[PDB]
Design an enzyme around this catalytic site. Structure first.
Site, mmCIF file in Angstrom:
data_model
loop_
_atom_site.group_PDB
_atom_site.id
_atom_site.type_symbol
_atom_site.label_atom_id
_atom_site.label_comp_id
_atom_site.label_asym_id
_atom_site.label_seq_id
_atom_site.Cartn_x
_atom_site.Cartn_y
_atom_site.Cartn_z
ATOM 1 N N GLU A 29 -25.965 -43.179 33.157
ATOM 2 C CA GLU A 29 -25.626 -41.783 32.913
ATOM 3 C C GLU A 29 -24.132 -41.512 33.212
ATOM 4 O O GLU A 29 -23.477 -40.905 32.396
ATOM 5 C CB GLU A 29 -26.492 -40.804 33.742
ATOM 6 C CG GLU A 29 -27.971 -40.732 33.305
ATOM 7 C CD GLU A 29 -28.164 -40.172 31.945
ATOM 8 O OE1 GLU A 29 -27.265 -39.505 31.403
ATOM 9 O OE2 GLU A 29 -29.287 -40.368 31.415
ATOM 10 N N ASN A 71 -21.958 -31.573 24.862
ATOM 11 C CA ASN A 71 -22.784 -31.797 23.694
ATOM 12 C C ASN A 71 -22.466 -30.731 22.639
ATOM 13 O O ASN A 71 -23.038 -29.634 22.675
ATOM 14 C CB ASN A 71 -24.253 -31.769 24.045
ATOM 15 C CG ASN A 71 -24.571 -32.774 25.132
ATOM 16 O OD1 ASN A 71 -24.407 -33.970 24.899
ATOM 17 N ND2 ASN A 71 -24.983 -32.294 26.323
ATOM 18 N N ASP A 130 -25.353 -28.617 20.689
ATOM 19 C CA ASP A 130 -26.139 -27.541 21.231
ATOM 20 C C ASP A 130 -25.418 -26.726 22.290
ATOM 21 O O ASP A 130 -26.052 -25.856 22.891
ATOM 22 C CB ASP A 130 -27.513 -28.023 21.740
ATOM 23 C CG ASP A 130 -27.471 -28.747 23.077
ATOM 24 O OD1 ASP A 130 -26.361 -29.078 23.554
ATOM 25 O OD2 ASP A 130 -28.573 -28.994 23.663
ATOM 26 N N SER A 134 -24.281 -27.429 25.165
ATOM 27 C CA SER A 134 -24.612 -27.699 26.538
ATOM 28 C C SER A 134 -23.657 -28.768 27.044
ATOM 29 O O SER A 134 -23.006 -29.522 26.352
ATOM 30 C CB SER A 134 -26.064 -28.138 26.650
ATOM 31 O OG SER A 134 -26.286 -29.448 26.156
ATOM 32 N N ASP A 185 -23.588 -31.942 30.189
ATOM 33 C CA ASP A 185 -24.266 -32.741 31.226
ATOM 34 C C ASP A 185 -23.301 -32.947 32.391
ATOM 35 O O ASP A 185 -22.149 -33.303 32.201
ATOM 36 C CB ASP A 185 -24.626 -34.089 30.658
ATOM 37 C CG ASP A 185 -25.469 -34.017 29.419
ATOM 38 O OD1 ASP A 185 -26.416 -33.250 29.447
ATOM 39 O OD2 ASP A 185 -25.147 -34.702 28.449
ATOM 40 N N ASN A 191 -28.336 -31.464 32.657
ATOM 41 C CA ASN A 191 -27.954 -30.643 31.513
ATOM 42 C C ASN A 191 -28.044 -29.147 31.729
ATOM 43 O O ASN A 191 -28.975 -28.585 32.291
ATOM 44 C CB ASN A 191 -28.889 -31.054 30.322
ATOM 45 C CG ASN A 191 -28.428 -30.400 29.033
ATOM 46 O OD1 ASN A 191 -28.930 -29.355 28.668
ATOM 47 N ND2 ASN A 191 -27.396 -30.966 28.424
#
Length: 130
Positions: free
Chosen positions: A35, A46, A49, A51, A53, A60
């Site tokens: 990750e 991202n 969408d 968002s 992380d 998220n």
């Protein structure tokens, strides 16, 4: 902070992650490795969408932590996303524990399916004394 591997493994052990909801420390370590590279400052936006992380576990902002700017968001960890960019991973670990209380467990991190599930993950904790 970018943790060293065994440093992180010991930290996660102290914070109660070994065997949490069935998940071994090596599986948590595999998750963190892929990750974020063990980096608490990691972020990934991202564009699809809106968002982001955040942190060592790439939690998220659409579903788990609040950053304000993500549309249609729910804050399941009841945490500011900023709390997930600290050197002190206590808040991150609390949120990860909350994520894996959902039925999918650690499979909530889709990439963990790809990078960790059904593999030999013993190398992530080898020599760390955990």
């Amino acid at each position: 902070k970018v943790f060293e591997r065994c440093e992180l493994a010991r930290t996660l052990k102290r914070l109660g992650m070994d065997g949490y909801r069935g998940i071994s420390l090596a599986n948590w370590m595999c998750l963190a490795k892929w990750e974020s590279g063990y980096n608490t400052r990691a972020t990934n936006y991202n564009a699809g969408d809106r968002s982001t992380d955040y942190g060592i576990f790439q939690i998220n902002s659409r579903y788990r932590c609040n950053d304000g700017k993500t549309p249609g968001a729910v804050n399941a960890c009841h945490l500011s996303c900023s709390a997930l960019l600290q050197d002190n991973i206590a808040d991150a670990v609390a949120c990860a524990k909350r994520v894996v209380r959902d039925p999918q467990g650690i499979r909530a991190w889709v990439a963990w399916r790809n990078r960790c599930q059904n593999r030999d993950v013993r190398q992530y904790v080898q020599g760390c004394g955990v």
